[PDB]
Structures are given as C-alpha cells and as structure tokens.
Amino acid sequence: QFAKPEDAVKYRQSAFTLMASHFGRMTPVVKGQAPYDAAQIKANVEVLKTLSALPWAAFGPGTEGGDARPEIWSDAASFKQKQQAFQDNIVKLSAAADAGDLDKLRAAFGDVGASCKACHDAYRK
Amino acid sequence: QFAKPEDAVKYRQSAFTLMASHFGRMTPVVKGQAPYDAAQIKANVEVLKTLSALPWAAFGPGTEGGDARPEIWSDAASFKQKQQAFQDNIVKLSAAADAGDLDKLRAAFGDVGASCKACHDAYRK
Ligand code: HEC
Ligand code: HEC
Ligand SMILES: O=C1O[C@H]([C@@H](O)CO)C(O)=C1O
Numbered sequence A, B: 001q002f003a004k005p006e007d008a009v010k011y012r013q014s015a016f017t018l019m020a021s022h023f024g025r026m027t028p029v030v031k032g033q034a035p036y037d038a039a040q041i042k043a044n045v046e047v048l049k050t051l052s053a054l055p056w057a058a059f060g061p062g063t064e065g066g067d068a069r070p071e072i073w074s075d076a077a078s079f080k081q082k083q084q085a086f087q088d089n090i091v092k093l094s095a096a097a098d099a100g101d102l103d104k105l106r107a108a109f110g111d112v113g114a115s116c117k118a119c120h121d122a123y124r125k
C-alpha cells in the first residue's frame, strides 16, 4: 500500500507512535498512580491489540529507511521471531485485560514492555 | 494521555496517517484496478473502523497546534457534528464490507471520503 519506500516508513513510524501511546498510557495504572477501571483497560488493550498487528507489513522488501536497521531484512527469521514473541505477549495482555485481573495485567504489561525493548535494542538504529 | 499539547498533536497526526493508508489503499479496489477480495476488505475496514475512532480524544482542551484550525475548539458543536457524521459514515462502510457487496462498498467509500474532505476544508489549516 506504499507507493514509495518512504510511505512504508511513515506508516510504521505512525503505528509505533500509536502503540507507544496505548501502551505507555497504562503505566500510571499499572503503577497504581492512576485508578484501575477494568472496562477502560479492556477497551484500551483492544485498541493496542489492533495497532500492534500493523507495523509488520510495512517492513516489506525494499522498505529500508527511517530508524530501521538493515539487519531486519538480512536476518528475517530473527526479526520474525522478535515480532512474533511481541504479538504473542500482546495476546497474553488481552487475556489479562479481558479477565479484569490487575496482577495478571501488571505481569503481562511487563512482558510486553520487555519485548518492545528487546526489538528496540536489536533492530532500531 | 498527552503530557504536553505536542503529544496530542503527534498522536492525532499519526492516527490520520494510518486512517489515510487504510482508506486510500482501497481506492484501486473501489476503482476496479486491483481485485476485490471481500474478506480482505472486511478485515481492512475493521482496522479502519478502530483507527477512525482515535483522533477525537486528541483534540482535548489546550491541544491547539499542528494543522488544526482554532475553530475546532471555538465551534466545538460544529466540529462534533463533522466528526460524528464521519464516524457514522464509517459504520455504513463497515456494514457494506461486512456484507461483501461491492456496490454498497463503492457508495459507502465515496460518502466516507466526502466526510474526510468536508472536515479537511473547514478545520485543517
Ligand atoms: C511495544 C508496545 C513497542 C513500543 C511501545 C514501541 N515499539 Fe518499536 N520500532 C521498531 C523498529 C524497527 C522501529 C523503527 C521504525 C522506523 O523508523 O522505520 C521502531 C520504532 C518505534 C518508535 C518510534 C516511531 C517514530 O515515531 O519514528 C516507537 C515510539 C516505538 N517503536 C515503540 C521495532 C519494534 C519491534 C520489532 C519486532 C517491536 C516488537 C517493537 N518495535 C515494539 C514497540
Ligand atoms: C477520512 C478517512 C480522513 C482522512 C483519510 C484524513 N482525515 Fe483528517 N485531519 C483533521 C484535522 C483537524 C487534521 C489536522 C491534525 C493536526 O495536524 O493536528 C487532520 C489531518 C489529516 C492528515 C495529516 C496527518 C499528518 O500527518 O499530519 C491526513 C493524512 C488526514 N487528516 C486524512 C480532521 C479530520 C476530520 C474532522 C471531523 C475528519 C472527519 C477527518 N480529518 C478525516 C480524515
Ligand atoms: O516500554 C518500552 O521499552 C522500550 C524502550 O524503553 C527500550 O529502550 C520501548 O520501546 C518501550 O515503549
């Protein structure tokens, strides 16, 4: 859906921006500094779930650019693993939110954050 | 969820970028230049539906900036109307996609585009 490589870059960057907002906005809730409304979190994690599936199709052949390291394409299996671990952690987070269970939410949120960071470290410039 | 006004601006801009991709990518399909896969479109409009609900909360009090005209806040009812018409057209588009009906899809897509443009003209700089 990306006329030029740059269009894929702008796409993925915007997806990550939104992912970051939907993830990061729950930190004061996971930390206890903002109140916990299970339905609010259930709805928010649904948004985050949708968003979290979006970037991957925007790392197609020939879409090198932005802060994407070239190893994303030369180590495609390793990047596929980091991405699939991440989305798998998203499934666990949806399950926790869907349960309305704050401890399971805190643990799932921590795992998701870790997978964000793991890819950050390997595959962002 | 926006520490500073600028954070709301970056949020909404990213939502619109993604909306634009998910809307605009269907043009060759609505035009007949790319093939029509009803399930592909059903899934895509589900994404667009999620995305299309996102910008509005990022035009909160005190988030003036970007290409947002100040009339968005001084004419809050008029902007609320343009936004609600738009999202209502999104519901019609979801119904068409969910039906797998290409003519209803083409008409719904046209109405959505028009609502995009109507707000563009009034409320973007
Ligand atoms: C888990 C929820 C997250 C969060 C919160 C973020 N990421 Fe990543 N990200 C990845 C790559 C390759 C990039 C560079 C993209 C490019 O420039 O082409 C990024 C970028 C970001 C950003 C910055 C976006 C921008 O405005 O430019 C942010 C805020 C961000 N990410 C947050 C790669 C990955 C992963 C690879 C498997 C995973 C997993 C994540 N990111 C997860 C997250
Ligand atoms: C219908 C599906 C659409 C599409 C495809 C787009 N819009 Fe709008 N949009 C609105 C406002 C006030 C802005 C300015 C935001 C800001 O800068 O603070 C925008 C911006 C855009 C963009 C540019 C995003 C960027 O990268 O900076 C794009 C690509 C875009 N829009 C497309 C306002 C509205 C509406 C008010 C009710 C409605 C409806 C729409 N936009 C709808 C759409
Ligand atoms: O929670 C997160 O951890 C990483 C980053 O902080 C690692 O440096 C990231 O992208 C997040 O949003």
Ligand SMILES: O=C1O[C@H]([C@@H](O)CO)C(O)=C1O
Pocket: B020, B023, B113, B114, B116, B117, B120
């Ligand atoms: O389909 C669209 O119409 C408007 C714009 O072209 C009006 O100038 C817009 O934002 C779209 O994505």
